[PDB]
mmCIF file of C-alpha atoms and ligand atoms in Angstrom:
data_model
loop_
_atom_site.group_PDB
_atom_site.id
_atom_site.type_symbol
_atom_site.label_atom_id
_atom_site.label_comp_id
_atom_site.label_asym_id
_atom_site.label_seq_id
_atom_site.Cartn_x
_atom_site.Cartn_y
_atom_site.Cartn_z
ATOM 1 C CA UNK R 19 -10.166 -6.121 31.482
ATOM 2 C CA UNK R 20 -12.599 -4.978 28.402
ATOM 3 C CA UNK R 21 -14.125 -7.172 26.260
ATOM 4 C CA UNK R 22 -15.922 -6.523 22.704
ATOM 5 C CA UNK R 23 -18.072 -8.794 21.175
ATOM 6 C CA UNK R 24 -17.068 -11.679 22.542
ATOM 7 C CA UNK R 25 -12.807 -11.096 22.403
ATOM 8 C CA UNK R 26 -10.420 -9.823 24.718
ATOM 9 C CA UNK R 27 -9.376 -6.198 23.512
ATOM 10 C CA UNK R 28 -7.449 -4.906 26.604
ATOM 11 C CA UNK R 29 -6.333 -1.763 26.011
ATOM 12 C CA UNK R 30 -7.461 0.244 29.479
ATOM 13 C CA UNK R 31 -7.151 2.084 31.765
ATOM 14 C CA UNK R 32 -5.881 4.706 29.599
ATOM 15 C CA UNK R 33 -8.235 4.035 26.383
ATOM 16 C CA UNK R 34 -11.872 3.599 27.110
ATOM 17 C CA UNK R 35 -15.454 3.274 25.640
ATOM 18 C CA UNK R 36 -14.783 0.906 22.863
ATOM 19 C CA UNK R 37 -16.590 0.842 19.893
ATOM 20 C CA UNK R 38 -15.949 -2.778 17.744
ATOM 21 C CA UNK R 39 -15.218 -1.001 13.813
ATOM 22 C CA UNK R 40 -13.931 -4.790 11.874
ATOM 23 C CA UNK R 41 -11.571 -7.197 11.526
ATOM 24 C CA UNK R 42 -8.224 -6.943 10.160
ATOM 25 C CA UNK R 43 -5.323 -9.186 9.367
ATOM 26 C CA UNK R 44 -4.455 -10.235 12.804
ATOM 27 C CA UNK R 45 -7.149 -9.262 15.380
ATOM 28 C CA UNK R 46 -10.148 -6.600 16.096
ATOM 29 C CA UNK R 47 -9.983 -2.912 15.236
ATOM 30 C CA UNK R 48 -11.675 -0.724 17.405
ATOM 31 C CA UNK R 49 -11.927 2.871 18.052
ATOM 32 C CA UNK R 50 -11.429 4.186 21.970
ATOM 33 C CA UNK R 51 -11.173 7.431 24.116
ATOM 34 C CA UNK R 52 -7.921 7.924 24.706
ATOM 35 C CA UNK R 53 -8.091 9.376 28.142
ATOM 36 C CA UNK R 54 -4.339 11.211 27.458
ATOM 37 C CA UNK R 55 -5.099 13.172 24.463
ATOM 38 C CA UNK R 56 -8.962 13.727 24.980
ATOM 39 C CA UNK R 57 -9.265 12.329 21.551
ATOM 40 C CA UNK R 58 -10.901 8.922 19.659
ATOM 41 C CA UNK R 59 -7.984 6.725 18.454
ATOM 42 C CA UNK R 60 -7.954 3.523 16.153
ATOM 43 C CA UNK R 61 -6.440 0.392 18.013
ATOM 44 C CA UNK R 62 -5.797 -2.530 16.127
ATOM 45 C CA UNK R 63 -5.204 -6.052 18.001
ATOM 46 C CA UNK R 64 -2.327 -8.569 16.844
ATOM 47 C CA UNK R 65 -2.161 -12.067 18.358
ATOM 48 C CA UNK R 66 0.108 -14.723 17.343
ATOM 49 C CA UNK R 67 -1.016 -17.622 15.572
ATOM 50 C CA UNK R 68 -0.686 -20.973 17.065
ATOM 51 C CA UNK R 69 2.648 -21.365 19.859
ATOM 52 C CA UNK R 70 3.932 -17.922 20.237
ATOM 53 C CA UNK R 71 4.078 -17.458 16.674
ATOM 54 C CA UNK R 72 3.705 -13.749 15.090
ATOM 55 C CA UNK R 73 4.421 -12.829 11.542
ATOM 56 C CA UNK R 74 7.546 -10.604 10.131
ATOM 57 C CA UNK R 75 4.695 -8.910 8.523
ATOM 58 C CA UNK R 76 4.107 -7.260 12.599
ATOM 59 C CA UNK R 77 7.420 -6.546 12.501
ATOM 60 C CA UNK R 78 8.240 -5.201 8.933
ATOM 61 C CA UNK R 79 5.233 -2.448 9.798
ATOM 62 C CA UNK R 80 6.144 -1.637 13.114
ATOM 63 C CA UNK R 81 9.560 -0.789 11.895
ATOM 64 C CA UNK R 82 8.883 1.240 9.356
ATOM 65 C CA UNK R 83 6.241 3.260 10.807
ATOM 66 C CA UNK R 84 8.044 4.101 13.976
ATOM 67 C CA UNK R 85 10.929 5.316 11.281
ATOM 68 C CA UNK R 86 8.629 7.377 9.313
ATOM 69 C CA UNK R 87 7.115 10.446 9.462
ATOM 70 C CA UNK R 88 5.011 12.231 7.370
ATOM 71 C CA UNK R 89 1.745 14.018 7.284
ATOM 72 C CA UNK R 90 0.158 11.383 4.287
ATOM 73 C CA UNK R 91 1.367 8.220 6.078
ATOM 74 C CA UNK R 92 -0.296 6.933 9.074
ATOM 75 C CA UNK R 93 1.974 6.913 12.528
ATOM 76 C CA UNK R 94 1.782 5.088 15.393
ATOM 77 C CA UNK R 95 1.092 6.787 18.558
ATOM 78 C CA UNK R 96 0.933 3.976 21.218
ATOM 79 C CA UNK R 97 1.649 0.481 21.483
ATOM 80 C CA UNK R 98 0.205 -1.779 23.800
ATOM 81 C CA UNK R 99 1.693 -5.351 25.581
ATOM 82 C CA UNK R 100 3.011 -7.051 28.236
ATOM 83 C CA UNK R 101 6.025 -5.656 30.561
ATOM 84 C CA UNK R 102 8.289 -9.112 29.759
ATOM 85 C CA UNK R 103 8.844 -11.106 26.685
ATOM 86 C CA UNK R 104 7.005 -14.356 28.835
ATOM 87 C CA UNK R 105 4.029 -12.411 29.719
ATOM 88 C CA UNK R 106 3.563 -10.787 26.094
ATOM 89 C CA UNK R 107 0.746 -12.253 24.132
ATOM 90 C CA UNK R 108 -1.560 -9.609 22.613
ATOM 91 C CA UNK R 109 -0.099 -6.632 21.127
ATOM 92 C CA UNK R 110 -2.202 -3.770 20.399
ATOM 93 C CA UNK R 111 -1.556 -0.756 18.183
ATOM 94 C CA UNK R 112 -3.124 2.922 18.595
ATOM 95 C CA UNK R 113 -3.297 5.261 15.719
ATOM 96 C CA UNK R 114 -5.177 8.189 14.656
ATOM 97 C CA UNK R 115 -8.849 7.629 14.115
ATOM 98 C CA UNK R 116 -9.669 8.170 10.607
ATOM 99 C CA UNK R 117 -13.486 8.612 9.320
ATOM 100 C CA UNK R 118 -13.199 6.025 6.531
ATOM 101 C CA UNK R 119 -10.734 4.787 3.636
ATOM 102 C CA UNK R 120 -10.738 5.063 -0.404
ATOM 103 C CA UNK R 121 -12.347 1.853 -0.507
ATOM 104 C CA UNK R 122 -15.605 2.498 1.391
ATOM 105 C CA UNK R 123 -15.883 6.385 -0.177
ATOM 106 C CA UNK R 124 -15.932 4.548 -3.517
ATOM 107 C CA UNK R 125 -18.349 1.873 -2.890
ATOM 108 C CA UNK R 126 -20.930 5.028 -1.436
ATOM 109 C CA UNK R 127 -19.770 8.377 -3.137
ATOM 110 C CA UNK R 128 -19.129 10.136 -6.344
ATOM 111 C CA UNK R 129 -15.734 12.191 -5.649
ATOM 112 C CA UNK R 130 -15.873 15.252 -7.773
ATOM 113 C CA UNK R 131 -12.824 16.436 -9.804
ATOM 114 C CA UNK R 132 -11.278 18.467 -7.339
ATOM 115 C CA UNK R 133 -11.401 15.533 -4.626
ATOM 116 C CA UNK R 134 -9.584 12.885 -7.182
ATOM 117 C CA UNK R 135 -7.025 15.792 -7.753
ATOM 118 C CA UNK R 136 -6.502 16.142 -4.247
ATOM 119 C CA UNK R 137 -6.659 12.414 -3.354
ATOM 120 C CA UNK R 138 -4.147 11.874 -6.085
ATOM 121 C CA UNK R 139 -1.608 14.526 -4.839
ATOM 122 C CA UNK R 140 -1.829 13.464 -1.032
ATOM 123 C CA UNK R 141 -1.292 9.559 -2.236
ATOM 124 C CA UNK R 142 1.782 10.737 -4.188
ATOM 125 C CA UNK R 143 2.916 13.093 -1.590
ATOM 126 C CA UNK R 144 3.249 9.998 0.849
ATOM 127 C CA UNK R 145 4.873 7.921 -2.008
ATOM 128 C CA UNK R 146 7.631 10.537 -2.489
ATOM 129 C CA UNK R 147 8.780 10.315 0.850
ATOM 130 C CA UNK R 148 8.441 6.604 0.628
ATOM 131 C CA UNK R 149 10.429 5.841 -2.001
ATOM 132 C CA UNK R 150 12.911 8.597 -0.503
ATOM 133 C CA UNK R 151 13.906 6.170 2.124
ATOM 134 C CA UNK R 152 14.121 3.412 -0.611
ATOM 135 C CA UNK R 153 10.550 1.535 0.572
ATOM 136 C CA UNK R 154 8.410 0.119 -1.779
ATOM 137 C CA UNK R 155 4.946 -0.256 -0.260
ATOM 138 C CA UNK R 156 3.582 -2.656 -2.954
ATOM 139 C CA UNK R 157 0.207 -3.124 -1.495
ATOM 140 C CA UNK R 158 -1.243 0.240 -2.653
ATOM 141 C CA UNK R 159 -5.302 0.093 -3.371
ATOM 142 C CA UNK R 160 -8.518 1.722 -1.957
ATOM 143 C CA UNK R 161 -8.508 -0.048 1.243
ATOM 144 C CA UNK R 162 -5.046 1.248 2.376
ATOM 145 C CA UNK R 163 -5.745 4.936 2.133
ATOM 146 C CA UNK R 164 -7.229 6.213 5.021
ATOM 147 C CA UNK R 165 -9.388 9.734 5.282
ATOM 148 C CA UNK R 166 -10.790 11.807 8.090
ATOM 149 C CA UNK R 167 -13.643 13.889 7.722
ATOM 150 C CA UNK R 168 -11.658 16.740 6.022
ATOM 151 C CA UNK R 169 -10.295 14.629 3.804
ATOM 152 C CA UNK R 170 -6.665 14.282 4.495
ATOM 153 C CA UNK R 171 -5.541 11.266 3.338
ATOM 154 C CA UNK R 172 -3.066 8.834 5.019
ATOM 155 C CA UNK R 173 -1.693 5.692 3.370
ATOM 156 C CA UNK R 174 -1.273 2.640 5.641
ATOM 157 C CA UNK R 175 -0.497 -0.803 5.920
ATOM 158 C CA UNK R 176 2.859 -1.319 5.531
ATOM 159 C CA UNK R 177 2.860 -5.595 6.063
ATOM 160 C CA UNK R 178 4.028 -6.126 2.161
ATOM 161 C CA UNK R 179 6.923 -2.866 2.302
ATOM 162 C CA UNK R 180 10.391 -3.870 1.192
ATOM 163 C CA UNK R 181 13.791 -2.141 0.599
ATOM 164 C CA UNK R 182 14.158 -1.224 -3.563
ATOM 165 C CA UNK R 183 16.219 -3.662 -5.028
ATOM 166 C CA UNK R 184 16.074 -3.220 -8.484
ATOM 167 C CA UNK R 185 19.596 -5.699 -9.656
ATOM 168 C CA UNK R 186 17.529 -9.004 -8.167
ATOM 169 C CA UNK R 187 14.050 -7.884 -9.804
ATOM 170 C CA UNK R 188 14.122 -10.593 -12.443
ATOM 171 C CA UNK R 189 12.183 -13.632 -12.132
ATOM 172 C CA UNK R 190 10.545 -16.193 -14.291
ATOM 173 C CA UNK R 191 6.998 -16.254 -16.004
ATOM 174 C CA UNK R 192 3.922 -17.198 -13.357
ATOM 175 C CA UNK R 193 6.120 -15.857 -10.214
ATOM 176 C CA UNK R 194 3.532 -16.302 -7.366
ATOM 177 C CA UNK R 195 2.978 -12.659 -5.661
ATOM 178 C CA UNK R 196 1.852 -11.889 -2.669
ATOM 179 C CA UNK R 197 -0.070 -8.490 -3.323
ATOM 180 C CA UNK R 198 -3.620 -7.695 -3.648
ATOM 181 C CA UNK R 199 -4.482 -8.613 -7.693
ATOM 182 C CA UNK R 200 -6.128 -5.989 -9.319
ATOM 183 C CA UNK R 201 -3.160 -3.499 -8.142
ATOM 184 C CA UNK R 202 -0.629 -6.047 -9.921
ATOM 185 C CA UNK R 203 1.371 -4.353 -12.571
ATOM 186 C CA UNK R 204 2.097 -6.570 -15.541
ATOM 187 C CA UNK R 205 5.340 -7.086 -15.152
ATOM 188 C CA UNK R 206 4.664 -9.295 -11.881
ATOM 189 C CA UNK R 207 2.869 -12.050 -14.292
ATOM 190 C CA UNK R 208 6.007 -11.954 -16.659
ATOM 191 C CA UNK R 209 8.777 -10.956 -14.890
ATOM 192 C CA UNK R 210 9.211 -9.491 -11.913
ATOM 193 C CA UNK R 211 9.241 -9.981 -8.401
ATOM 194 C CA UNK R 212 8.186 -6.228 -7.792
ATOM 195 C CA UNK R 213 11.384 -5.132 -6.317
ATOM 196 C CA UNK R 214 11.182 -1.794 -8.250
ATOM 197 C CA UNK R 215 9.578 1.578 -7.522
ATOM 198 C CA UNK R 216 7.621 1.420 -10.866
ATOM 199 C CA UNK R 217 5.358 -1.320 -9.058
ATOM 200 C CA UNK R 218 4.035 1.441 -6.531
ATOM 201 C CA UNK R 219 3.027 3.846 -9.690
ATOM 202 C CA UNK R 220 1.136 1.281 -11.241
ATOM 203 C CA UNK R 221 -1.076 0.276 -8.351
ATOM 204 C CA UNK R 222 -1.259 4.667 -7.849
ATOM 205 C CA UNK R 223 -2.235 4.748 -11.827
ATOM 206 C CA UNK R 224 -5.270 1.303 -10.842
ATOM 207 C CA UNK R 225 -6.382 4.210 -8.063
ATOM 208 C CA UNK R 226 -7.015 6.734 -10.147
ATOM 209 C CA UNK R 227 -8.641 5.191 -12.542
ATOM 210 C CA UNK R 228 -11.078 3.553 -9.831
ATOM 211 C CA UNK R 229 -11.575 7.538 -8.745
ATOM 212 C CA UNK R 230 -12.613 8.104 -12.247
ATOM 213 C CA UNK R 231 -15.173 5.264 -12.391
ATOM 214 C CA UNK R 232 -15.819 4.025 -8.763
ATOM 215 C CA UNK R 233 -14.542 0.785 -10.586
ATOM 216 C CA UNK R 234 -11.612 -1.425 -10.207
ATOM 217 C CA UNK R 235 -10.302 -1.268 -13.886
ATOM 218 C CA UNK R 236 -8.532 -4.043 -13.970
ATOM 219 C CA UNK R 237 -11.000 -6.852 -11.774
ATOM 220 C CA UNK R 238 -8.964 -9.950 -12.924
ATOM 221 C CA UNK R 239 -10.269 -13.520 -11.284
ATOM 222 C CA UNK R 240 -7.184 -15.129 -11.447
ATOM 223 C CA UNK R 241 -3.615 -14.437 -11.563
ATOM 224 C CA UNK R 242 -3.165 -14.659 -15.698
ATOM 225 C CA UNK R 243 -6.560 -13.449 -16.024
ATOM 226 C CA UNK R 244 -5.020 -9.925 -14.192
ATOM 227 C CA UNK R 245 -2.483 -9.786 -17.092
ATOM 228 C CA UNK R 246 -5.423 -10.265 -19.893
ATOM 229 C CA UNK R 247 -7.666 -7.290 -18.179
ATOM 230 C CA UNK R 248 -4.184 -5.103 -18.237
ATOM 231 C CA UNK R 249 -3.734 -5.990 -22.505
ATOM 232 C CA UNK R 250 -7.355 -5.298 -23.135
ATOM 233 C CA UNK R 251 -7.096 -1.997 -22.300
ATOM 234 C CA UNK R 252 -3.476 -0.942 -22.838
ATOM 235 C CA UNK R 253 -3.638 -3.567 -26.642
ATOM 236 C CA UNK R 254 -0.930 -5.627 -27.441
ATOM 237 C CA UNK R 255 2.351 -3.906 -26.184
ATOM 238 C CA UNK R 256 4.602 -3.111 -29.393
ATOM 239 C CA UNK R 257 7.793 -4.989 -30.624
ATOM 240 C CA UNK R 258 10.087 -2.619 -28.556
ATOM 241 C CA UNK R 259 8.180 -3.072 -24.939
ATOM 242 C CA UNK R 260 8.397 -6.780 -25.745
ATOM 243 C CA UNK R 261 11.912 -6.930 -26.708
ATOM 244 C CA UNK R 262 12.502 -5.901 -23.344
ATOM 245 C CA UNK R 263 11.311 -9.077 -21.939
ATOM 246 C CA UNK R 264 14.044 -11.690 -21.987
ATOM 247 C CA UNK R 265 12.331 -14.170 -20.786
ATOM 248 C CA UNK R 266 11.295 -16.417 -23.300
ATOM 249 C CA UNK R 267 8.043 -18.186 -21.431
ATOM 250 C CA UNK R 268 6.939 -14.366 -20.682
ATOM 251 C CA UNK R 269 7.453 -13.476 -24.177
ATOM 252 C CA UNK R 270 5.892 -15.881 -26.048
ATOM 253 C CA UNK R 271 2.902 -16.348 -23.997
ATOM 254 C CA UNK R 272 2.880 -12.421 -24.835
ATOM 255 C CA UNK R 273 3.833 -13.434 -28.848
ATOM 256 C CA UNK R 274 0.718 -16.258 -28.460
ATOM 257 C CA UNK R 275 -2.194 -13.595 -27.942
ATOM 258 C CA UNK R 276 -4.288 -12.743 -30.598
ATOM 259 C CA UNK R 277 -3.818 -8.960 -31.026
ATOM 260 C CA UNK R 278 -5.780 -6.476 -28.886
ATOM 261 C CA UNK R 279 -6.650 -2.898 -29.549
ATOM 262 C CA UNK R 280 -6.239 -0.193 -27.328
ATOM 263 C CA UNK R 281 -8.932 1.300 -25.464
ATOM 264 C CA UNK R 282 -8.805 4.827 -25.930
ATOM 265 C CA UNK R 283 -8.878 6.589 -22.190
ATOM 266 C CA UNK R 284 -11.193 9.137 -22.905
ATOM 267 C CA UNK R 285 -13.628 6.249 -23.923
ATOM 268 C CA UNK R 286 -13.027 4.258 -20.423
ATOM 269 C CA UNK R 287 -13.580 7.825 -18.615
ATOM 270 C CA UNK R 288 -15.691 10.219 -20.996
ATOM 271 C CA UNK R 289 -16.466 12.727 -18.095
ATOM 272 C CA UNK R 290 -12.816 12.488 -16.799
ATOM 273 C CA UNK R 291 -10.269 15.795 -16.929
ATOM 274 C CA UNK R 292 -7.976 15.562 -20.082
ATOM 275 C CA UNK R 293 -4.862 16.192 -17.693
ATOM 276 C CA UNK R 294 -6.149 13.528 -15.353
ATOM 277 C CA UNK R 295 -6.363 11.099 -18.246
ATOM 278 C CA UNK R 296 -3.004 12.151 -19.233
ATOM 279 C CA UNK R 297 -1.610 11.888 -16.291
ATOM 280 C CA UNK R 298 -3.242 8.160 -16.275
ATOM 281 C CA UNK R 299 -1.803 6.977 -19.305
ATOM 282 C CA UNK R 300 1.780 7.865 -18.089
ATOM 283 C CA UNK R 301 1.454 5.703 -14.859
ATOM 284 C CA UNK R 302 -0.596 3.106 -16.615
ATOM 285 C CA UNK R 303 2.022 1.846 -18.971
ATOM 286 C CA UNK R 304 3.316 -1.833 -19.870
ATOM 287 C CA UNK R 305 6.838 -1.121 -19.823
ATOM 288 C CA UNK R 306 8.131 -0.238 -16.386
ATOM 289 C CA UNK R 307 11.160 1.278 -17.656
ATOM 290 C CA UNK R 308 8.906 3.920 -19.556
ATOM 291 C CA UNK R 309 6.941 4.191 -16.279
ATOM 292 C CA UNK R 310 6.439 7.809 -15.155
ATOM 293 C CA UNK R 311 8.188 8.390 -11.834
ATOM 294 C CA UNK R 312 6.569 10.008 -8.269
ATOM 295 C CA UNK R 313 8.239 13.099 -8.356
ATOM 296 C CA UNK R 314 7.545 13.337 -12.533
ATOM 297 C CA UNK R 315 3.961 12.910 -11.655
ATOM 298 C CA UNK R 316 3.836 14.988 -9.185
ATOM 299 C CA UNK R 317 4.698 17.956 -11.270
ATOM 300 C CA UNK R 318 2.120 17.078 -13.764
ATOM 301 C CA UNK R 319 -0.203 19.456 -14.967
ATOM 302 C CA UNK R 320 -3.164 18.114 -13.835
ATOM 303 C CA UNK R 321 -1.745 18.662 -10.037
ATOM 304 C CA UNK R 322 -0.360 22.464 -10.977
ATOM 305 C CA UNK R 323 -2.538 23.839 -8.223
ATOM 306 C CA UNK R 324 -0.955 21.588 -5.129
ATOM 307 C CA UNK R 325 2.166 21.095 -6.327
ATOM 308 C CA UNK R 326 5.756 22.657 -4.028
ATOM 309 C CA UNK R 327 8.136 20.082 -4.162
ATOM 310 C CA UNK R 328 9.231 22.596 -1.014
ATOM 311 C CA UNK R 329 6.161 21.016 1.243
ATOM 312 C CA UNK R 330 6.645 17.648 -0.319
ATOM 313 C CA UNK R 331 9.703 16.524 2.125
ATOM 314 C CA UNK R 332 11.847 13.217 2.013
ATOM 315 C CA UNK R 333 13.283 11.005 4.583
ATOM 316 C CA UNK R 334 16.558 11.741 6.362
ATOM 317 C CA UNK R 335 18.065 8.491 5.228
ATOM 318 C CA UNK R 336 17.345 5.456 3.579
ATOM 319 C CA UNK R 337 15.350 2.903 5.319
ATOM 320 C CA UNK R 338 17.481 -0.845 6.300
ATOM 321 C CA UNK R 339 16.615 -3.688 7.615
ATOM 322 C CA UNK R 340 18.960 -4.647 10.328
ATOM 323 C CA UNK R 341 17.823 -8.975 10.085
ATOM 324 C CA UNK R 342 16.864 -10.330 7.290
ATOM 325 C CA UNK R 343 12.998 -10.798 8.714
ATOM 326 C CA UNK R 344 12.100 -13.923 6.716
ATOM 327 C CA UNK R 345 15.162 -15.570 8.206
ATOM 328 C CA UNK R 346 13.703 -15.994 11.413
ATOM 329 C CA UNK R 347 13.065 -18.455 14.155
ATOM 330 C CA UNK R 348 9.575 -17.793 15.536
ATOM 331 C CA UNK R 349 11.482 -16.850 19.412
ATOM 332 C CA UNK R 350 14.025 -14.410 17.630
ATOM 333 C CA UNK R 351 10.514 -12.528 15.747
ATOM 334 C CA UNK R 352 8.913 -12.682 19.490
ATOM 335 C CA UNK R 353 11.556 -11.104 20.540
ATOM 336 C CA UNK R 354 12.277 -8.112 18.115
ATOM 337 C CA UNK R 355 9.081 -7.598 18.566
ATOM 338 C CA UNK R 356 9.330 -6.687 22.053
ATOM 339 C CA UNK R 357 12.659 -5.056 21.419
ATOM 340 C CA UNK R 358 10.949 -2.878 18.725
ATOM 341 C CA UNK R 359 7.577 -1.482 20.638
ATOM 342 C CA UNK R 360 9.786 -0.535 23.835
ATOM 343 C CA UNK R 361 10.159 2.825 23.486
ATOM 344 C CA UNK R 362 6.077 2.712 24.752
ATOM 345 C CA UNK R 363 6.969 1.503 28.064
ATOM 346 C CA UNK R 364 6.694 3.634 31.074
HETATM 347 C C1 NX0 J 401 -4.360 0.168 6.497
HETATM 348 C C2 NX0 J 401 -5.581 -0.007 7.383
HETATM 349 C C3 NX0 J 401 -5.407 0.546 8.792
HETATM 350 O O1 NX0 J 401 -4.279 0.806 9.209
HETATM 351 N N1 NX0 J 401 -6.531 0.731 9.587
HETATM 352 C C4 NX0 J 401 -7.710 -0.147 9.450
HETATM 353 C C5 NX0 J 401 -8.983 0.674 9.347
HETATM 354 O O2 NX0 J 401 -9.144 1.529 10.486
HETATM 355 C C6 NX0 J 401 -8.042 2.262 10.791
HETATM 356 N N2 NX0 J 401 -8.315 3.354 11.528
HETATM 357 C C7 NX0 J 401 -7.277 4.135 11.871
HETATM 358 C C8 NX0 J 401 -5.971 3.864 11.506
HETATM 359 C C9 NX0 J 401 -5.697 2.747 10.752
HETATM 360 C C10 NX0 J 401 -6.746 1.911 10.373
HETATM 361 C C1 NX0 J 402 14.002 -2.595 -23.007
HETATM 362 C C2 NX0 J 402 14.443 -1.234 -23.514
HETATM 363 C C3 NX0 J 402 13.669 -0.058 -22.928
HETATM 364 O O1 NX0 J 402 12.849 -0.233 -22.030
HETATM 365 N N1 NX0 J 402 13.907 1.202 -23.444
HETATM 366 C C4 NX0 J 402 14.415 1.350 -24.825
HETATM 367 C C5 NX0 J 402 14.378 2.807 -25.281
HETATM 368 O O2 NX0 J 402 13.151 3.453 -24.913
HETATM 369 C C6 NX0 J 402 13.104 3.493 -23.567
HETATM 370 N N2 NX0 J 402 12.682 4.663 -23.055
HETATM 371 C C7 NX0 J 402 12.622 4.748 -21.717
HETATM 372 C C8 NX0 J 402 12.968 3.708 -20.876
HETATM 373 C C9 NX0 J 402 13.397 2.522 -21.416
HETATM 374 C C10 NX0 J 402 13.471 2.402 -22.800
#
């Protein structure tokens, strides 16, 4: 079997010619030939940790992928393992090869206007038909959007998804989250466990802004020091937005704060499109409730020219999770895992 830089990344006879592209969360990427299709592919490589030990996170993606489909969300085409549940180690996952991702354009490239605007509308495209099925991807930043060399746009990564569940979104002040920081909405330092679809549109509103600059806006060091980047910018949210928050740690930490003035947009961004920066402020704001919603953005102004909520399709149902997949003994994950990437068996 192959071998890349040092590691096992079996994936022949049908992909070939492997070229080592990172690391990820679980193993290798490469790309490959796949011999099939006459076509490069991404394969990523997942091995358990320790004794036979995988993570629901495996799972949680693999499920929702294979139940998705949609042009601005990344599939996946193959997956790779063992014929029995005793021989199954490695598991490999192929995908389409994409040139780069938002994160790497940003660190190298100026987008114009007409690239943010198009980036913006594909992002939201895929989040409509997300939050059709009920999903909540709630890791949204650079890093997870995926482009090819024509510049479609495909959101991935999927390991952090969970069903809406806006009744149990309530939590105390200084609830650990698992999410990448600077794509935090405020509410997850005061309180909420980001259980509601307004948590996507914030981290949408962080990308934009990022497109505007080729800067995170909101670079916090530390969890509270995300919710102090968030107030310098936005100010000091008004009596109303904080009467919302119950919570009386959240709201008097809030209360404590010396007041902070608002940073007008146009400031932050002075070469930015006024609709862009409108559009900004709407998914940028403190209280969730007041939030602007995907389908509300997507018939913005500033995306007039792409938007047909006719070519913007939604999911045939909403998406369920049959276990509970945090519930889990490590054998029962091992083997819904097997049960799951069947359908790739000859
Ligand atoms: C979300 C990241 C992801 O799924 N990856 C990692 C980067 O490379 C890659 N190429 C193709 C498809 C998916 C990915
Ligand atoms: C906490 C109350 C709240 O969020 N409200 C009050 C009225 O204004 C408003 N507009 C939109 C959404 C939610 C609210």
């Amino acid at each position: 079997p192959e071998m890349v830089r040092g590691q096992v990344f079996d994936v022949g006879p049908r992909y070939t010619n492997l070229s080592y592209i990172g690391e990820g969360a679980y193993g290798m990427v490469c790309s490959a030939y796949d011999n099939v299709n006459k076509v490069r592919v991404a394969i990523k490589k997942i091995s358990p940790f320790e004794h036979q030990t995988y993570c629901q996170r495996t799972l949680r993606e693999i499920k929702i992928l294979l139940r998705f489909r949609h042009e601005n969300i990344i599939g996946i085409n193959d997956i790779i393992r063992a014929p029995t549940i005793e021989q199954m180690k490695d598991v490999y996952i192929v995908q389409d090869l994409m040139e780069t991702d938002l994160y790497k354009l940003l660190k190298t490239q100026h987008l114009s206007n007409d690239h943010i605007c198009y980036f913006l509308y594909q992002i939201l495209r895929g989040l409509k038909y997300i939050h059709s099925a009920n999903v909540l991807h709630r890791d949204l930043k650079p890093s997870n959007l995926l482009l090819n060399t024509t510049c479609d746009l495909k959101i991935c990564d999927f390991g952090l998804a969970r069903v809406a569940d806006p009744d149990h979104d309530h939590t105390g002040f200084l609830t650990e989250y698992v999410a990448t920081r600077w794509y935090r909405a405020p509410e997850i330092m005061l309180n909420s466990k980001g259980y509601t679809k307004s948590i996507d549109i914030w981290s949408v509103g962080c990308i934009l802004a990022e497109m505007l600059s080729n800067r995170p806006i909101f670079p916090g060091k530390h969890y509270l020091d995300q919710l102090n980047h968030i107030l310098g910018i936005l100010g000091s949210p008004s009596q109303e937005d904080l009467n919302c928050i119950i919570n009386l740690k959240a709201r008097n930490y809030l209360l404590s704060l010396p007041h902070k003035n608002k940073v007008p947009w146009n400031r932050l961004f002075p070469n930015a499109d006024s609709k862009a920066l409108d559009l900004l402020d709407k998914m940028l704001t403190f209280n969730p409730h007041k939030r602007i919603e995907v389908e509300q953005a997507l018939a913005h102004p500033y995306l007039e020219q792409y938007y047909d909520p006719s070519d913007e399709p939604i999911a045939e149902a909403p998406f369920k999770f049959d276990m509970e997949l945090d519930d889990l003994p490590k054998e029962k994950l091992k083997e819904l895992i097997f049960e799951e990437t069947a359908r790739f068996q000859p």
